[PDB]
Amino acid sequence: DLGKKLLQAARAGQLDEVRELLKAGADVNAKDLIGVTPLHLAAFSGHLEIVEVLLKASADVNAKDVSGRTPLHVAAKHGHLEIVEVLLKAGADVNAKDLIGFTPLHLAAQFGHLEIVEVLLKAGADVNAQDKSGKTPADLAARAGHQDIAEVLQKAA
Amino acid sequence: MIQRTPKIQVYSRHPAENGKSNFLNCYVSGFHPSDIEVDLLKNGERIEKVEHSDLSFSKDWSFYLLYYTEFTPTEKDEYACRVNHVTLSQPKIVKWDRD
Amino acid sequence: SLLMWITQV
Amino acid sequence: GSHSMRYFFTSVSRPGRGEPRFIAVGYVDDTQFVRFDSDAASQRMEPRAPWIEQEGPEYWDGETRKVKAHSQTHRVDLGTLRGYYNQSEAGSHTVQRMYGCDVGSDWRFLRGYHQYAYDGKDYIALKEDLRSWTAADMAAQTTKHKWEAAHVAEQLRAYLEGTCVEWLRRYLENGKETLQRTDAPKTHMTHHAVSDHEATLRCWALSFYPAEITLTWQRDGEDQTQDTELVETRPAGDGTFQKWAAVVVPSGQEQRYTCHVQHEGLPKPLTLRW
C-alpha cells in the first residue's frame, strides 16, 4: 500500500521520500478514512517543498476531507502563508465551503492571520461568506479579538 | 462560579530521619480555579527555592499541584506550607508533622 | 502524539 | 495491566494581561512524559521521561505544531464559549480538555474517550460509542450540533482507535523498564496515645507504583470504616506515591486490630498486625 507510506511521509516531512514515492506512482490524491489528503498533511506541517512537489504531481487542490476542509482551510487556520500562495497559484477554490460552512477566509479571520486574510482577499475570497451559523468573518474576528483584521474585512466589504 | 478549596498535605519524600538528605513536599489537590499562591516556610519564613510540577486536573475538573524542595530535617527545625486561594479568605498554614 | 485535527467549540 | 495515554489541556482567560495561559500535559499511565506551557521560554514540547528523549526532533517539531494548534483552538474556544454563555469579558474563565485511549493486557484497543469542561463544569463528552455526544446544556447542545455536522466524532474515532494505540504501544516498548514496573508498597504501623483513654493505630503505605491502592480496617470480621480517617494517595516526587490510614482504637487492645493491604505489586498479600 503505497498510499499509507506517502501519507506518513507527508505527515513526517521526508521531502526526498515524498519525491521517490510520487515517482513510484503513489496516488497524489490518496485518501485517508477521514478523507484527509497528503495535501492537508503538508499544509498542516508547513512543508512548502512537499506542497509544491505534490501540486506538480497533480494533487487535487480542492479535495474535501470528511469535515469538508480543503488544504486551503488547513493552511489558513495554521498560518502557512507561502503554502496558501502556492495553493492559490495551483487553482485552490478561494470560496470552498466545508460541512460547517466555514471558508478558509473564516478560519484566517478567526485565528487572526492578517497576511493570509489579505492574500485571500486579493484572491477573491468572499468577505460576505456566511457559515451555517450565519456568522461573517468580521464576527469571528471580533469574537477572537483580532480587531485589526475585523476592521480590514469591514472596510474591504 | 464553582469555588473549591484545596486539600493541602505536607510531607517528606522519605521518612524524616536526621543526618540524611530528603525533600519536603507540599501537595495540593482539588482546588478550582488554578490560581493558587503557595509557599513553603522554614522556622516561620519563606524559602525561596520552591519548585513545582506541571498543572494537571482530576476527573472532577479540579487542579492538583506538587510543590517540593530539597531540605534536611533537624529536631529544631519547623517547616510549614502556606497556601492561598480565592476560596481561602486568609491563607491556611499547616505545619509539617513528622507523622 | 496529540490529535492532529482538533475542532473548535 | 491496562495502560492509558492521557492528554490534559487547560486554558485560562487572563483579561488585560492579554494572552491566555495554556498548559498541556501528557501521561502514559501515571508517568508524566510531555508538557507545554505558554509562559515557558522553550515554546516546545519538552521531554519528562528518559524514554521520550529518544524520540527525535521531527516528532518534537510536529508536537510543537499540534500543541500550538491546540493553543489557538482553545483560544477561540474560550471566546466562543464566552459568547454562548453571554458573560462579560471582565473576569477570568477556564477551558480544559482531556482525551486518550486505553488498552488491555493484550494491548488491543480497549476503550477511548474524550471530554470537555467549561468553567470547571462538564460541558461535552464523547460517549463510549465514540459516535454520539452527551451535551450538558443548550450551549453544549449547540456545539453538539456543530460537531455532528462537522463529523468530529469520525476524526476522534480514527485517532483514538488508530495512532493513539500505535504510539502507546511504542512508548510501552520504550518505557519497558519504567512504565512496566510495579513497586509494592512498603508499610509500617505507628502507635500514639491520642488521649489518656483513646489511642490511634496508623498504617502507612508509601513508595508504590501505580497509584491505585486499597487499605482498610477490620475488627477481625467486623467493618471498621467508622472511627477512621483517610487521605488521598499522594506523590513522593520520586515518581511514586504515598497514603496512610488510621483507626481510633482503645489503648491496650490485645492486637485485635490489623492492617490489610492490597496492591498489584503483592502476589501474596502482606497483612500484618501490631
Numbering used by the authors:
A (entry chain D): 13 to 169
B (entry chain B): 0 to 98
C (entry chain C): 1 to 9
D (entry chain A): 1 to 274
Sentences from the paper on this structure:
We established a process to generate bispecific designed ankyrin repeat proteins (DARPins) that simultaneously target HLA-I/peptide complexes and CD3e. DARPins, which are based on an ankyrin repeat scaffold, create an elongated solenoid fold that creates a rigid, concave interface for target binding. In this study, we developed and characterized bispecific T cell engagers by combining two highly specific DARPin molecules to target the tumor-associated HLA-A∗0201/NY-ESO1157-165 complex and CD3ε. We demonstrated that DARPins can serve as a novel scaffold for TCEs that combine high specificity, potent T cell activation, and minimal off-target activity.
To elucidate the molecular basis for NY_1’s affinity and specificity toward HLA-A∗0201/NY-ESO1157-165(9V), we determined the three-dimensional structure of this ternary complex using single-particle cryo-electron microscopy at around 3 Å resolution. While the DARPin/HLA-peptide interface is well defined, the HLA-A∗0201 α3-domain and the solvent-exposed residues of the NY_1 helices appear less resolved. NY_1 binds on top of HLA-A∗0201 via its concave, elongated interaction surface, which runs along the entire length of the peptide-binding cleft. Each constituent helix in the cap elements and internal repeats (IRs) is oriented perpendicular to the HLA α1 and α2 helices. The N- and C-cap elements are positioned above the peptide’s N- and C-termini, respectively, while the IRs of NY_1 engage the central peptide region (p4M to p8Q). Notably, the spacing between the two HLA α−helices closely accommodates the entire width of NY_1. NY_1 interacts with residues on both the HLA heavy chain α-helices and the NY-ESO1157-165(9V) peptide. The centrally positioned peptide residues p4M and p5W are surrounded by the hydrophobic NY_1 IR1-residues I46, V48, L53, F56, and the aliphatic portion of the N-cap residue R23.
